[PDB]
Design a protein around this ligand. Structure first.
Ligand SMILES: Cc1cn([C@H]2C[C@H](OP(=O)(O)O)[C@@H](CO)O2)c(=O)[nH]c1=O
Length: 124
């Protein structure tokens, strides 16, 4: 039902805050973006930049994805991100996440017309 571009937006964009300011950020966000509905998604990164700035990464440095594909792009500049990772104690339906805020380059895979992000590969 969901398009790949829409799924990327839902899972990875949070332009409403400039950074995670709370250890509970990931618990709240993972739930509100419906990433804990049927299982606990083990890892997920939110990006705190405008949608335009993230879409613009598809015209920046072309690099290999972890899987060997060559439609990945690394941002020229660092971006505000929050990594959310399940803790060792987490068990569905009570998903529990560690929140780690950082400023780093992002790497996304791009596809389509318009050519936009569809997968979050990594941050560096
Ligand atoms: C390593 C890493 C993976 N992931 C993601 C990308 C994926 O979802 P997606 O491909 O929908 O963007 C996923 C594995 O399926 O874990 C992050 O969101 N942040 C990370 O730092």
């Amino acid at each position: 039902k969901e398009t790949a571009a829409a799924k990327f937006e839902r899972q990875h964009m949070d332009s409403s805050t400039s950074a995670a300011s709370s250890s509970n950020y990931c618990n709240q966000m993972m739930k509100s973006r419906n990433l804990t509905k049927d299982r606990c998604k083990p890892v997920n990164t939110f990006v705190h930049e405008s949608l335009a700035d993230v879409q613009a990464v598809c015209s920046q440095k072309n690099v290999a994805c972890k899987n060997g594909q060559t439609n990945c792009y690394q941002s020229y500049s660092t971006m505000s991100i929050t990594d959310c990772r399940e803790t060792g104690s987490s068990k569905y339906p009570n998903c529990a996440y560690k929140t780690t805020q950082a400023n780093k380059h992002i790497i996304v895979a791009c596809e389509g017309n318009p050519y936009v992000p569809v997968h979050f590969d990594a941050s560096v």
